[PDB]
Amino acid sequence: EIPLKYGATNEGKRQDPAMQKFRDNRLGAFIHWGLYAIPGGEWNGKVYGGAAEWLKSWAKVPADEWLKLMDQWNPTKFDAKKWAKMAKEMGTKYVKITTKHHEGFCLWPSKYTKYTVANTPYKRDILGELVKAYNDEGIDVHFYFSVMDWSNPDYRYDIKSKEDSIAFSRFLEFTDNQLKELATRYPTVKDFWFDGTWDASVKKNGWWTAHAEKMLKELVPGVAINSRLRADDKGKRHFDSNGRLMGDYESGYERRLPDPVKDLKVTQWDWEACMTIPENQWGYHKDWSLSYVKTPIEVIDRIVHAVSMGGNMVVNFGPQADGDFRPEEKAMATAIGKWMNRYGKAVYACDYAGFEKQDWGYYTRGKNDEVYMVVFNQPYSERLIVKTPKGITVEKATLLTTGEDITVVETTRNEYNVSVPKKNPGEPYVIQLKVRAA
Incomplete structure (x- = not known):
């Protein structure tokens, strides 16, 4: 045994009712929606093939200039009740929503930054409206949250100086503040799904990852927390230095699934796969001809595959800047829902x-x-x-x-x-x- 202060907290699967619900749900949808929906993979006449939600990086756009996209945030076709009806008809039992992606724009009116929905022409609390509408349909809501934040100059990729240390400490405080704000503003939240935790700065601060898990579990009874959040005392991620899963479920088969013959080990823990419809686009990209786009049967195969190996599957949607869904996505959700209505007794x-x-x-x-x-x-x-x-x-x-x-x-x-x-x-x-x- 390697002694650890910040390693695994669960031994085996959680079996309290909240985790049994997370598990039994089985089929979710993901929503990636943020400022990247506006350019939709194109910047100044160049369409970039990389993931649209990373366009700030591909096109080397300075933060202030990227965040000026807020002036164009006015999704007049947005209707949370219509979104919730779409999810219901698809057969999803939960929806995971990007509260804030790497760009740092917040879908809720955070008091800790100006880069939020409040300071756009639309003004409205998108996240709050979605929480209410999904919950009214009996659909659980999970929050995606990116620790890496391109909008906050206190973020650091590594700690190489005293000034880096001090800045990053302020960043972790800011992060704590936003997380507590999400947990208290939206107390029906059932899960936090962390992303953007791979940098050396976070790996060197495993203590913080353990603290975030504990803080959220104190604030939201029964909440689930993904493995991707977590680093141990030695900087080992997902699984600690003794090979034990950290957080409540493994989040890793992102656009990849365990082998049905060779990877039966995954049956020993809860896990959740998340998948894109194109090969590698999460946010809205205007040109889906650029990579292979999965058909409904291909998606259904992946859903059943995950459940067959004891895992959940989450199908991603990247809404349009106007607040509607593209035709390919409406077709996908409808086809999945038709199949689930007929065969869902083998899934749920x-x-x-x-x-x-x-x-x-x-x-x-x-x-x-x-x-x-x-x-x-x-x-x-x-x-x-x-x-x-x-x-x-x-x-x-x-x-x-x-x-x-x-x-x-x-x-x-x-x-x-x-x-x-x-x-x-x-x-x-x-x-x-x-x-x-x-």
Whole structure:
């Protein structure tokens, strides 16, 4: 054991009701919305291929000039009730919102900086309106927060002088102030998802990361805190120097998912993946031809994949500067919602099933021993192979949508062919198994 003051605080998964809710939700949406939506990846006639929310960096824009985009912040089509309805129809159980991204513009009227929604033509507390509207639909709200802040000259990337130390200490105070403000202004918040914590300055101040977790947990009963916030005494991030997960869940499979065969270790902790629709755009980018754009079925595959390995999945949206969503995003949310309405019993409140991975798709397990086969790849053989763990048998198979009985044939000791449905469902589909343990 390496002695640590600022390492892991949880042993194993939290099982209090608030964490069970975070987990059972399973499917979320992400909102990246800030000043970067205005230029939408273009600056002075050049369209940059990099992530739109990083345009200040790509185009080397000074802070004062970038922040002058506030003069153009007037999203007249914004309607928090419409956003919440969109999320509800998609089947999301929670929404994670960029309270402040690296640019430092705040979606709530912070008293600790002038770079906020209050000092724009629109004036209104976007974050507060969203919290109310999502909550009215029974949707939990999580707050994204970037520690790295390009708008505050006290930020430092590393500490190389006494003046750096003093400035960064002021920065950490400012950060604390904003975090306490979020936690008290929006007391229904269920999670803080930290970003921009990779710099040497933060790594050298692991004590602060532990303090932030503790401070927020005191202010917001049951709140979840992501692993990305956390560094230990030695500067090790996410997992401490003894290999123990810090925070309440692992946040890391950002546009990447664990391997269904080789990465079963992830089933031992709570975790949440977050994904973009294009390859690498989070904020609004005006030109989605520049990289591969995922289809709804590709997104649904990723959602089920995460749940099959005991994790949550969050699908990102980058709203337009005007406060509406682009057509591709409206189509995506609607297609996901249609599928979730039909097949969501295999997603919501489901978890890892403990079965060997098969080529047809994924298993998920419900709260009362239901085992769902979620079929993405239809065998020409018309047989879905099911290999059961020792002592487990398959008593029945049923097509989820219709309740029709599906033939199950024992082929070997411990292996069955489950027939495909008589009629090809023509989309990824669910067969529910009844299983028995010896």
